[PDB]
Amino acid sequence: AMSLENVAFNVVNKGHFDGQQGEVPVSIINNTVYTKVDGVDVELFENKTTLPVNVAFELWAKRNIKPVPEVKILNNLGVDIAANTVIWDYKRDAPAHISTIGVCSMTDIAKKPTETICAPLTVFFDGRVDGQVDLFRNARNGVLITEGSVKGLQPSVGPKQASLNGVTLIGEAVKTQFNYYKKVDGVVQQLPETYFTQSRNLQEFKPRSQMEIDFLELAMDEFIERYKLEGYAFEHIVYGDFSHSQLGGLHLLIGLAKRFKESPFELEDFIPMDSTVKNYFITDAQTGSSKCVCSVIDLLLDDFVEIIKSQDLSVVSKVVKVTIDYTEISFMLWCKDGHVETFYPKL
Amino acid sequence: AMSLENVAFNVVNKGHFDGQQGEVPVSIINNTVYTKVDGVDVELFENKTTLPVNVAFELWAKRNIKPVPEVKILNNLGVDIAANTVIWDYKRDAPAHISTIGVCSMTDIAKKPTETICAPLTVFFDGRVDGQVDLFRNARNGVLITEGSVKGLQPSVGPKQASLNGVTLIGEAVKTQFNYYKKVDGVVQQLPETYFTQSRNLQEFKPRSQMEIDFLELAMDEFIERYKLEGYAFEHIVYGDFSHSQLGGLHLLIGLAKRFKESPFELEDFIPMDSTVKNYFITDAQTGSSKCVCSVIDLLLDDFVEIIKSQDLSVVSKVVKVTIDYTEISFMLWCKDGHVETFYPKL
Amino acid sequence: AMSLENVAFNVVNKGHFDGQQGEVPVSIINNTVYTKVDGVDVELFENKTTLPVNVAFELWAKRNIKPVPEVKILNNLGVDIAANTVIWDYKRDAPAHISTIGVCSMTDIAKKPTETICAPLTVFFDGRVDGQVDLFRNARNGVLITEGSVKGLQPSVGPKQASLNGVTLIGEAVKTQFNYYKKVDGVVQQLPETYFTQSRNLQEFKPRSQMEIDFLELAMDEFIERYKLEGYAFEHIVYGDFSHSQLGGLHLLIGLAKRFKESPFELEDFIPMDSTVKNYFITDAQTGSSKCVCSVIDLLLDDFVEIIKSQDLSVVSKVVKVTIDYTEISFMLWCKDGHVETFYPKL
Amino acid sequence: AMSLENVAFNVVNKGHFDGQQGEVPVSIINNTVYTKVDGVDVELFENKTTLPVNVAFELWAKRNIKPVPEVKILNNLGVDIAANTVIWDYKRDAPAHISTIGVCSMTDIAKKPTETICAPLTVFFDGRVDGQVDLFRNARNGVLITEGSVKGLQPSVGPKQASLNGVTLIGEAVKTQFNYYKKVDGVVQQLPETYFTQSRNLQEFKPRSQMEIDFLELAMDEFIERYKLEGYAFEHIVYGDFSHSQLGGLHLLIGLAKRFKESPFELEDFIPMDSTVKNYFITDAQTGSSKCVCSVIDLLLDDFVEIIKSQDLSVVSKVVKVTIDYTEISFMLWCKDGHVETFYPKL
Amino acid sequence: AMSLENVAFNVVNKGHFDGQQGEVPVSIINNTVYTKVDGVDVELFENKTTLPVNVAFELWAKRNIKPVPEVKILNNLGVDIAANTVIWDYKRDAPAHISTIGVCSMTDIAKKPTETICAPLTVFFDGRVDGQVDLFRNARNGVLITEGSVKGLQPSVGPKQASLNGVTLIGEAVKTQFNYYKKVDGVVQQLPETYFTQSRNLQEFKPRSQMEIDFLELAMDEFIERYKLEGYAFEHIVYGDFSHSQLGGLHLLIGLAKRFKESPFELEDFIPMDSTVKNYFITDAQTGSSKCVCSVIDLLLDDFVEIIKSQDLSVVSKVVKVTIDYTEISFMLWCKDGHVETFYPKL
């Protein structure tokens, strides 16, 4: 039987819900869950979601603590709901999906993914859990992830990294590379060929290729000449211009990291969530240059160089469609006199 | 096995906690408890107390639903806590006592009344529950109530009425008259002789003696002459004076009912709780006469007549101590030329 | 000197702030003020305003408890603020004015009415308080009320009733009729000749003239013939039409009381506030006839008859402006073939 | 056409209110504004102010995003309100002024600065906006800032730095130095000659002169001898004494940074707001030396040296008035035997 | 005398309550205390406790600002309440004890420690306050701390560090080493011989012995070969195993700091409170190794090697009881073939 006190007992004894028996005193005040330890109140959970505090507490205690795809990947694949698990969104401090299957009586729309209400929805299946591969095989719309290969389905190799308790990492002791499968209306889809965002963070940016190491260590002109990027506007697209009141270019995360190690500045993440492309209110503290909305994507610099070289520079103004993170991303390309003026992700 | 969902299931199915097994979905939002009935949220409880909402909900679901002494009686007896039950205060919309014994893990200071922490406290025992008379016999400080007589203890006959689910009544199908026993520091006390307030309500006042029937039906002068109350200031201290801006007298509830029948007015209960003496902000809508602090006691008119006749009229000013509801009530008496000027309960 | 605990002590001991010394323990949880009486929490005040809970509690404890003009009268006279007092609006359950003078440190814009910030504001002065008449004489914009006459100023006789602790009444033991004075930009104004709303309530409606007694007792036709109202659409304006799905007429409170005494119905006061003209969502429970916006004014039936008999009765459609409660009220008049079609207050 | 949904649309698409057309779904729960992005709720704004959540959200979305004077400068100049803009106070996380002009219908006291209610207030005008210089010329009380020079008024050169989106910076790509003008009762004032606070923070302290570089790098005695500050108590005033339980001196921010480089410590900003002089509860983690109220000012070390050399050493104890940030700052000076004992800003 | 406004005045002018006279305007909105400074609201306190906001604000303003034992020491010693002071728990952001003596009228159970209600409780006495040593001498259950020696009682030397305004430090300018005394039921106890935890922090870890310096600087194998720790499983117990999905060992804080220097990781403090043994949800960002519950204790490395060498290495499995911080800590010891398998604090 599911009880708030049992959930709190599991949290205080194991850090998350593990299906153990036991109760613990609980107080609920002002969107916060408290438990009494030695006659003194200790906070267990602060509700940051729009759900009721007890419902959110139960959903958070039942979050998946194995490595899972970043919620941006699930969004791009159209996942509506997860089967028998909770994907916690650590960017929003909330559950990734509004409804559940077989998790919480206050949010379940079904107990099993095989029920009728779930058929039109794209269900997330985890092949690491026994029986979920067969559930996906019988399901109408859904997305499957496995560590290895499943019989009779062609895998799509996903990102190297995954999310584990809200920290994104490429696994060494754990497998974070999954094979992705998708079915729409009963027919197994063939996922497109895509680039993947590196999901790196600005403050602890770490290079993942020799080219990124050079970009961080070298100066502008040396890097531009070493990789033959003379006609590709890297000094504006990637390095960023800080000479005018309006900030120029600066659409790759690695350029932001370069500037940050050079001189710190602050990003206003005015839509805090997980996306392939993020928009920031960027103020440069050294110069005062600023831009209200600056679209930033964190690609591997090698991949972005490949994309920028694979473009036709004869056009003046066009929209480039790049498949990144299993989704189509629109880039505006401006070329003049055989060289590009800007190349930024569209809004 | 104690759980919020189980408490809510008991409330939904039986109206109060009965110790049945089962669970229902619960939502807690803004000091309110909701449950899902056929996909929509139905409010079960609104926390009016200073306790956390879930704690207050559990305490309210476990209130005693048998006839119990009014909380004013328990207060006058010095009851600190009830043994293995919750006395709900329906005037404050809150539990009558701040701690419990063997009721709620968030508010219990002990599981049994025999614990050491309970020894200095005056515990309330209910002789209608098996084993409580022996618990009282072994207890150090406590108050016992029984339907009948217990061997070796002299009863104190209590009020005729009791409280049942928040409505005060003199029982016909149920017994509402109790025998009261009290122990202080291990020695059985002798409760004093007292009058009891009638706990009547202004809006639905009903007479309970022939004299009260006469008081309601007759006019002033004929009632005064029929009971020889000529020298006892009844026309001021009972009927009320409405000729000046400051309201005069009007200290008996029956006088309030008399005035209310002919002309309704406004009572502001600025300290809403249960007391032998109540203080009201009274404004008379017919005349505009008003008084900020009008102390009101609801005695049987016969008892008040007995009290007023048993007074010494030779004094000019003195404080009269009357035992009402097992407590000492101070009355201010003003006598002039051998007749009463005022007789009102002190503050 | 001013403290929340002292305010609570005054409320507990006197029902309102009286400037007595003493403190009492206070708790503030969820827009509610609690005090501890015998180890138990008793609610003193629930904040229904948009102010902070402690500020609202202090303002409510310092409300005027003498008879005062109704809030609608002060609004029509342009009163912005009261001098050294709080006018509590019992319709809104909030202070009538947003700033104070010499009342609350969290709300005062000045300590005295004579300061410069108060000069452009219309201040309310109470001649029953010593010195306020001279303050008004020196003030630039203000409104003065007195019981009697002041030297050198021509009174405007106000309504018969006033408000005392939130109950409207014509005073007998206390004087509720005031003389009104108004100064604009330093020059004493001449208040217009006006009608006054009776401020009566629907459920407990009392006639104030023989004509209203006849209206309540007689049937329609006898009343119409007795007062020669044959060409004045009293069938529609006053009595109300309940034959169509859309409710007809019914713009006088006495008509609503007439309908209510025989068949109760539902009023939705969707703008709960004090005004000369009230708008209600009327649903007639007997017939189902309903109207979303039904403007209602509570005039004395004699005065409304006088108004309706002073109309031209020849033009087809016009707006007639009547001075009621010191303000101009627009009525739409429809006349056809020399008789009134409808006559309702404009929105 | 002002609307909460339109404000949220502007925030979602541009990070601030820009006047674009569009709507997004909005939820308001518990002083937080949420919008729905792809079926999940994303928090846009958390209300930290005393205003209603929607009002605060609208005011925050309409904050000035160009460089503006720091809030303390405006406070020292007596600015009551800004004309047609919102100055956001990022220290308090709230609007800098309580009323607006032509910004929000819930907080506006006027639509244009030329209205009568604004005349007694000191309005803030921004010369970078067309028409505001003329508005200031016509205004009775106001403060004007311009990038350049206005015809017929003598500028007062302001601080080098300004605030831009809540980060203080000396602008390179944008101009952050303003000319200040002030009118009182219609007459153009002559602003005093003042020092300016450097508005630096502890963690990222940077020198702004060769003397500060020496102070950060040199040892105590080396610096004292190099700049001949032998009789000026720098070892107590600036460096700070950490030998007793009560912390000694340490009234300049550069000294705090000097100590912080060696051993970090705790600053408790118990009045979090912007002011020329800040009071901190300082506990030194290395030694345990602490002081409850440590007044700190961030002057350029050169300017403070000039101030302390400009003093008269013969007096024993006097109050020194220094004009800093357009306001008078009282310093307490103690001298003994012709040398300074202590020199701290008064409380 | 005790007022919320006076408490706020003391906080504004002194940073804490000092018993100065004065009042300041206060607003209370949503568990936050605001004061008005120059017409704008500045937040003074945000309530993080389960108490009412004003009660918590008063308790926080009256916290002890002198060095005090860490609340874990008081908990292990059984302290129920402090005498005439408030111990603030900065881990919980709440008062360390639920009741007070002579502090706050809303939370006091007595005014003096000598009253009867306090007799069965273990009261905390501070010998640095005059009269408290005598109060402890007369008390029945209590704990005493003094800087020096008291006549006729054998001291127990406490930890080197204490807490000062929420920061733990070994005092140089102030004494943080206390002598501890304890009485149970009137008889002076003899405290056991104990180890003490170092209370150090992960991110700013500092070695406090030559052995810890070597542990931080050396490599694993070099350190093990020194100090002769070959048969004591330090590789697992102290350094931590990061090769499997489940994190191995890592039960000493110094090992956490060692790993953190080379590669930062995530600690989830799911029970945030002060304790001798802490449980963390640790996920290693470099490898992905993680463990839901990691018992961590911050002992001096010398003390820990002494404990582990003091063990009987012939048993296969047993529970070792170590007295740390005046409490018994159970360690599970696993040994095979005469060498340790693992040695972790029991959970």
Author numbering:
A (entry chain E), B (entry chain B), C (entry chain F), D (entry chain D), E (entry chain A): -1 to 345
What do the authors say?
The NSP15 endoribonuclease enzyme, known as NendoU, is highly conserved and plays a critical role in the ability of the virus to evade the immune system. The oligomerization is mostly driven by the contacts of the N-terminal (ND) and the middle (MD) domains, while the C-terminal domain (CD) carries the canonical catalytic residues from the endonuclease family. In terms of substrate specificity, NendoU of the coronaviruses is described to cleave a great variety of single- and double-stranded RNAs in an Mn2+-dependent reaction, by hydrolyzing the 3′ end of pyrimidines, with a strong preference for uracil, and to release 2′,3′-cyclic phosphate and 5′-hydroxyl ends as products.
Despite their similarities, models showed consistent differences in the switch region. A general observation we made was that particles from samples in basic pHs, such as HEPES at pH 7.5, tend to be individual particles, while particles from samples obtained in more acid pHs, such as Bis-Tris at pH 6.0 and PBS at pH 6.0, tend to be arranged side by side, forming filaments, which is a common mechanism of allosteric control of enzyme activity.
